[PDB]
Symmetry: C2
Subunit: 274 residues, 2 copies
Amino acid sequence: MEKRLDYITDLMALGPTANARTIQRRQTAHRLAIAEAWQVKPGEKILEIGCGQGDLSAVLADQVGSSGHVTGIDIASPDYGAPLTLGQAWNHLLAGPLGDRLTVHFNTNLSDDLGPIADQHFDRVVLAHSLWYFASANALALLFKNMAAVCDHVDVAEWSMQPTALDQIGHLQAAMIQGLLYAIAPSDVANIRTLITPDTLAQIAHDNTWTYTAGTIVEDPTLDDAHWEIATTNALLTELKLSTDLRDRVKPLLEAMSHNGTASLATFTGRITF
Amino acid sequence: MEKRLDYITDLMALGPTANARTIQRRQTAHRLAIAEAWQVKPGEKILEIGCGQGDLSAVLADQVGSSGHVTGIDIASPDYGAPLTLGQAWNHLLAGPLGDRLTVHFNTNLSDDLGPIADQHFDRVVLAHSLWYFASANALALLFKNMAAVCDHVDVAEWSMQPTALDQIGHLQAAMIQGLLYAIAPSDVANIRTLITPDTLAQIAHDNTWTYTAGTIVEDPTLDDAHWEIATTNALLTELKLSTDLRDRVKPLLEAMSHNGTASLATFTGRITF
Ligand SMILES: [Cl-]
């Protein structure tokens, strides 16, 4: 309960529901922890891949100070989201106290080509909880290859599939079930697509003659992420176009998951150096 | 009780390794804990589905006394197994102190032909760690329907997919991975085919106006059972006919599994009363 946590939380656009701010404050606290793990300093110019509604971008903008800058990239449209769209969220940030430190490029895929950041350099390119959304591990590796042109390293943070408490097993199960099903038969309806781990990142590094360095683990079990993911997995077995037999077979995994808690996994961090 | 541990262990034919007896005593002890949970009484006639080399059968035969009897069913051949075949194991049991209390039917699947037990009635039918081999949950249900005619209740024991310690997570993942891979690439070599939980059994009971009664959990983390199941899961990437893509998405779930311990899961027990 830092003044600073509350300061940054209060800079965000909120939905109108009862628990909006308490949910937001947890999300914001987790991004401060991640920023602390990465040792983000005042003055830096940072590029964030997978910015979504700006929870991390807002935190980084505060951290880098009035002479720093943070550019968020997302493949999503600004009109995506409810109750607030991603553009409503960003325009709120841009019209606020950190606005001059912030830029956002929506509908943007930087593996295609550097496009809107084409001639810039950054002190840091970062990804937090966007790794699992990549099409494949090779696709993540190609993004990194491109980023080598704009920075000397990429910092990452993503859920760990090594649960540190038993009440995190539900979340591990939701992730595995989504990842396996996507692997079995890909879908455009899919949320989680590739379950990247620190060993995947070490292998990407080895394949490309880079280095991967593990950083500190970030614990944040009170994040609503687990509950959201377990519901997403439940939703997906109905929404996916699965055979009866495959559906029926996934059923016991959903049952088990319902009994394995609702705390959020720990989050691993690390750095790919080119 | 457990007071009969060494007596029963000593009835068992051992393979040639230094720690065969130590491994056997752990297995016999696990079956005694299951028998204790089920509350087997003197004089009972019992039918056991998936008796394997008779680790449970012998325990049961001891407990029912010379007034009871234990019939073991296995789908495998007498010549199955190394360094001890199932028939070596069983012929030894039949020649020993408990042999008059025991009967075995190899190459027997009562889902396919009920002939081998024609006209027989039993006090209970039991299944310990044979639920996951069933072709499907409906196939299990159908067998129970057939057993309703010839006994009062069925007692079950099986791996619980709710870890009680973090070091059991690897065993859980082994089971999950195997169950979804069997959904898409079944093999004869595969032995985890359908995952079955207490919720599965409750639903089966609901569908047929039977009662399911959860019993007590059996903890035995020192069993080698997780170690072997984890090894099987790694190996099935090689043995199963998988697409290159599925392979390379599962390959790193396996590496993830490697960091989540090698202790065995708890065992759930319960009764379907017809
Ligand atoms: Cl053992």
